[PDB]
């Protein structure tokens, strides 16, 4: 709870302190929103839940799929995703996304089980049968979206950037597979409306310089503008830029 009132002191600009108690307040209880929602989710009416949840600006999503080029969604880590999942599982069928293995393994079992529960294929970054990227690659070509969670990557793989003025490392899978793949890389964003569910679509990333700093920078600057637009719905918890951090990669 400390590293998360750190953050938000850095979406806010504002020392730890000086974080509004109000927003700290509303950051935790959608935090435990989330994993209250995400108890009981696997149980819920899926086909409601797609039928009366919307989408904002989702026909990008559906022009990109009408050109067969695939889709790249990239997402922060705000209001609940797995509700996103669900809606696209509904709306338009299961999609392949990557796991952290964590452990104990039983626990990455437990957390397998939970999103496939949903419709989602999952592929495990470690120990599987295929690299992920490739298959991710293969889902792209095949003209179907796969989904990843782009504003947390903080290992020697990741692409270091600019992130609410601090220096942050975000994945490089987005832009990765929207080059080879020349996928549609639309950011996306997850918060909490009241007592539903708020989900917008973005307008697709320039792919065109190739360079995958510049494209993970641009889907920074994006995530930064809608966390900074739904300050209390981004519960990331864990250090997210580098000077909460220790040692080197």
Same mark, same amino acid.
């Given at each position: 709870?400390?590293?998360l009132?750190?953050?938000?002191?850095?979406?806010?600009?504002?020392?730890?302190?000086?974080?509004?108690?109000?927003?700290? *307040? #509303?950051?935790?209880?959608?935090?435990?929103?989330?994993?209250?929602?995400?108890?009981?989710?696997? #149980?819920?009416?899926? /086909? *409601?839940?797609?039928?009366?949840?919307?989408?904002?600006?989702?026909?990008?999503?559906?022009?990109?799929?009408?050109? +067969?080029?695939?889709?790249?969604?990239?997402?922060?880590?705000?209001?609940?995703?797995?509700? #996103?999942?669900?809606?696209?599982?509904?709306?338009?069928?299961?999609?392949?996304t990557?796991?952290?293995?964590?452990?104990?393994?039983?626990?990455?079992? *437990?957390?397998? %089980?939970?999103?496939? !529960?949903?419709?989602?294929?999952?592929?495990?970054?470690?120990? +599987?049968?295929?690299? =992920?990227? %490739?298959?991710?690659?293969?889902?792209l070509?095949?003209?179907?979206?796969?989904?990843?969670?782009?504003?947390?990557?903080? &290992?020697? !793989?990741g692409?270091?950037?600019?992130?609410?003025?601090?220096? @942050?490392?975000?994945?490089?899978? =987005? #832009?990765?597979?929207?080059?080879? &793949?020349?996928?549609?890389?639309? =950011?996306?964003?997850?918060?909490?409306? /009241?007592?539903?569910?708020?989900?917008?679509?973005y307008?697709?990333?320039? @792919?065109? !310089?190739?360079?995958?700093?510049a494209? &993970?920078?641009?889907?920074?600057?994006?995530?930064?503008?809608?966390?900074?637009?739904?300050?209390?719905?981004?519960?990331?918890?864990?250090?997210?830029?580098?000077?909460?951090? !220790?040692?080197?990669?």
């Amino acid at each position: 709870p400390e590293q998360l009132r750190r953050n938000l002191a850095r979406v806010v600009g504002k020392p730890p302190a000086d974080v509004p108690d109000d927003l700290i *307040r #509303a950051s935790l209880a959608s935090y435990a929103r989330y994993w209250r929602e995400a108890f009981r989710l696997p #149980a819920m009416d899926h /086909g *409601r839940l797609g039928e009366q949840l919307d989408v904002i600006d989702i026909d990008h999503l559906w022009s990109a799929l009408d050109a +067969g080029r695939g889709a790249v969604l990239a997402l922060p880590h705000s209001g609940n995703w797995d509700m #996103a999942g669900v809606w696209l599982v509904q709306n338009y069928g299961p999609f392949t996304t990557v796991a952290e293995r964590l452990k104990p393994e039983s626990l990455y079992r *437990r957390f397998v %089980e939970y999103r496939e !529960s949903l419709g989602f294929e999952v592929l495990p970054l470690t120990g +599987g049968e295929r690299p =992920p990227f %490739e298959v991710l690659a293969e889902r792209l070509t095949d003209n179907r979206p796969i989904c990843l969670m782009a504003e947390r990557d903080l &290992t020697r !793989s990741g692409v270091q950037v600019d992130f609410f003025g601090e220096a @942050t490392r975000m994945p490089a899978g =987005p #832009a990765k597979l929207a080059i080879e &793949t020349g996928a549609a890389l639309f =950011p996306v964003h997850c918060w909490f409306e /009241g007592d539903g569910w708020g989900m917008r679509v973005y307008p697709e990333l320039d @792919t065109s !310089s190739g360079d995958v700093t510049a494209i &993970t920078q641009a889907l920074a600057d994006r995530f930064a503008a809608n966390i900074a637009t739904y300050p209390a719905d981004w519960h990331m918890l864990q250090p997210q830029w580098i000077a909460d951090l !220790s040692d080197e990669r």
